[PDB]
Amino acid sequence: AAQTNAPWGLARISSTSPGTSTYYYDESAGQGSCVYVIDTGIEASHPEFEGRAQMVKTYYYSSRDGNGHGTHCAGTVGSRTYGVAKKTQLFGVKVLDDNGSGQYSTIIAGMDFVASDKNNRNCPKGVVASLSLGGGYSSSVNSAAARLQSSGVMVAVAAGNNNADARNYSPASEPSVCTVGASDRYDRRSSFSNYGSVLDIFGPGTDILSTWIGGSTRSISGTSMATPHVAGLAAYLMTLGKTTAASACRYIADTANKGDLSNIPFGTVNLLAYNNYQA
Numbered sequence: 244a245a246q247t248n249a250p251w252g253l254a255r256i257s258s259t260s261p262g263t264s265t266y267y268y269d270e271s272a273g274q275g276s277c278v279y280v281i282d283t284g285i286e287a288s289h290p291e292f293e294g295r296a297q298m299v300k301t302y303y304y305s306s307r308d309g310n311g312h313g314t315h316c317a318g319t320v321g322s323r324t325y326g327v328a329k330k331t332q333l334f335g336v337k338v339l340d341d342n343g344s345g346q347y348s349t350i351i352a353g354m355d356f357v358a359s360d361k362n363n364r365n366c367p368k369g370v371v372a373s374l375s376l377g378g379g380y381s382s383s384v385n386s387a388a389a390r391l392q393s394s395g396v397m398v399a400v401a402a403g404n405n406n407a408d409a410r411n412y413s414p415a416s417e418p419s420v421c422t423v424g425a426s427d428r429y430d431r432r433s434s435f436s437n438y439g440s441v442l443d444i445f446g447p448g449t450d451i452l453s454t455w456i457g458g459s460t461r462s463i464s465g466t467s468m469a470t471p472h473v474a475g476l477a478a479y480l481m482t483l484g485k486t487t488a489a490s491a492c493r494y495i496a497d498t499a500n501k502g503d504l505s506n507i508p509f510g511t512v513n514l515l516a517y518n519n520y521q522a
């Protein structure tokens with residue numbers, strides 16, 4: 244399948260070079276997989292989700308996304324026009340308030356929730372969790388992310404936006420999950436992206452168009468935007484049978500575009516997520 248005039252990040256993940264505008268992908272499109280988006284919520288009524296999104300848990304007064312951040316990330320995973328895995332099922336867990344903030348105890352509870360809730364869901368091709376959030380180092384937050392991965396869920400987390408070594412941020416610094424940095428449309432590391440030995444992979448993160456609340460769309464930047472590209476790619480690859488939740492991060496790294504990025508400090512991987520699609 245081919246999507247013409249696609250957002251640049253979708254085109255980039257299906258090409259060996261920058262500057263293309265068509266997203267090439269297999270028609271299976273992540274069907275049979277499930278992605279939990281652990282964030283500010285998802286506006287599940289947005290037409291771009293086609294009935295494939297639902298809220299399953301909130302830690303606040305309402306399950307509504309009053310911010311937009313979670314709806315944008317969910318759109319990059321699996322919306323029709325803006326998503327990597329256009330037929331996946333999306334589940335929202337609201338651990339962040341409508342200002343985009345949340346306490347570590349609530350974030351931990353949301354990860355433990357997903358590890359249990361997945362046993363109630365029909366996800367024959369596998370389960371992914373996308374965490375576009377983080378803060379200062381906490382061993383308890385890292386441990387919760389490690390538990391979620393060990394339970395059989397592919398965990399993708401943002402590296403952080405501090406232009407610093409990700410070893411001082413959580414859950415980015417947990418080795419056992421998939422820690423995602425950001426790149427721009429010219430194959431440079433995004434100017435805000437964290438780096439360091441704990442990063443596993445880069446994805447598109449500067450000027451990413453996706454869904455927004457009120458049935459709208461908007462372009463924003465961050466490692467929060469790169470993370471759902473990798474989460475959606477994992478769901479897509481699991482549906483094709485190429486990898487499993489336990490090994491998806493390693494498979495993505497082994498099959499990535501290598502050496503294409505500039506402004507990568509010594510000691511950080513030079514790997515950009517790539518779907519290896521061949522018609």
Ligand SMILES: [Eu+2]
Pocket residue numbers: 259260500503
């Ligand atoms: Eu190349």
Ligand SMILES: [Eu+2]
Pocket residue numbers: 417418419420421422441442443492
């Ligand atoms: Eu890792």
